[PDB]
Amino acid sequence: NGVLIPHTPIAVDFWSLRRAGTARLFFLSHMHSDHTVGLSSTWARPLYCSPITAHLLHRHLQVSKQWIQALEVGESHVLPLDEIGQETMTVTLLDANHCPGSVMFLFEGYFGTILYTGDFRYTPSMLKEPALTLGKQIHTLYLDNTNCNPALVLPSRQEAAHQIVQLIRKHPQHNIKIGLYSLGKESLLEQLALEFQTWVVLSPRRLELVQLLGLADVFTVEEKAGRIHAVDHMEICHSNMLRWNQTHPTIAILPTSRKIHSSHPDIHVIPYSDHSSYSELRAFVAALKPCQVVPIISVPLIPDSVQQYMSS
Template identity: 65%
Template sequence: MSGTVIPGTPIAVDCWSVRRASGARLFFLSHLHSDHTAGLTSTWSRPLYCSPLTARLLPRHLQVPSHWIRPLEVGQSHVLGEEVTVTLLDSNHCPGSVMFLFEGAFGTILYTGDFRYTSAMQGELALRGRHIDCLYLDNTHCHPHRALPSRHRATCQAARIIRAHPQHHVVIGECPRLPLRSPRQAVLPLPHAWSPLGSPGRCVQPGEGDAAGGPGAGVQDLGGGESLAPGADEAAGAA
């Protein structure tokens, strides 16, 4: 899903063409991956709503002027003008990524953007008892004959690949336009909730990184956009 102007509303999500979004007054950014920020540059000059983490990264990565950025707390409802109430929900995709629940005279709209579904999402307080009139659904990996591996399984697969190639310098994170320093350097994005640290043959559970003593030898932990070594996308299982 690369952005849209929602008909019958003043809302544009991940859409940064002022000409295409000429009727929009409220602009929302779901997350910072490049396919959702095309056209968003340092010349942007309208209020932009996003999660607090995305708000902190925007000026650094895209040089968007800070005075146009309006961070909204995740899990809380926010009234914007007299027309729209929006609630941001964690989309379980990348750091700072969110779904948007819009409410107004136009009804109730859920815009997922890129997300990784978990059963826990059914327990979101903002969604309980709500009738969704319109659903904008990212279905990139929604195919009946293709099973997307769980985040835990994908991380363990990636950890095995890293340990099988000790001669490589592996950078773990999401690093836009990160130059490879040598032919043996691989850039492998991994889900932000997991880290292949600790002893060989095991995956570290969330929160164990500090106790495990931080990244292992030859592994550098970074943050940022999307670069991928050949064949690593299947192993990483990115959604």
């Protein structure tokens, strides 16, 4: 899902080195496991991400802080595009509403004005951003088209949370297992501690993420402290259901955005989305008025100092 912006040394969510070649500036929109393969402690090329994303990157992939130029969201920053003090480029990061520390990259330079949305959840608060309200003409919109496919309809983030509450409402005497990825859906955990008036059980790593975000003190790591446990999504399987059901009558919930058949009756696959709906995007593009939209073309005039930067 990485993107090499053609005729630029720009790479967003791309870390293959050998497949890039021309790339010299690598951006990280958010810290989901799917957009970061090749990133580790051996990574030694400049990297730009959001504040929260900077903490999560150094801590959980052991990436050296010397390669992580973290920039504040909302503000525009001047990045070099060569080895001399000549060409530069402005980047403005915009909150993506997708997950903790998720951003949208807005580039400006010899290539034009490119807006990279990455993964993002649309809300009309996004149009009111000062970066996109100066009437600037975006030349290319690398847009999140996840829910633009006409295949299978996934409910919104709030529709799925309603079904989860109805599910636990019908099982008041049950232990609830919730499978998640390494990031996202922490605010949903908060909504379940309120509705059901329990403490939510996490792993120590997940507890660190939550305190990093500034959420309510409704979480704990003691197993016996609550009926709702948050576990890794790869834990929810037929073998583990029998293991949990041997102790206490347990229900398992899998919030996923893919077609999955429950391999156990007490496993409930709930369709999540976490991306903008089609109509939300069609109003998002009708407001931006971009010259062209690219899913996740014109060749610019590469300067002399930038053409050398790409070939070393």
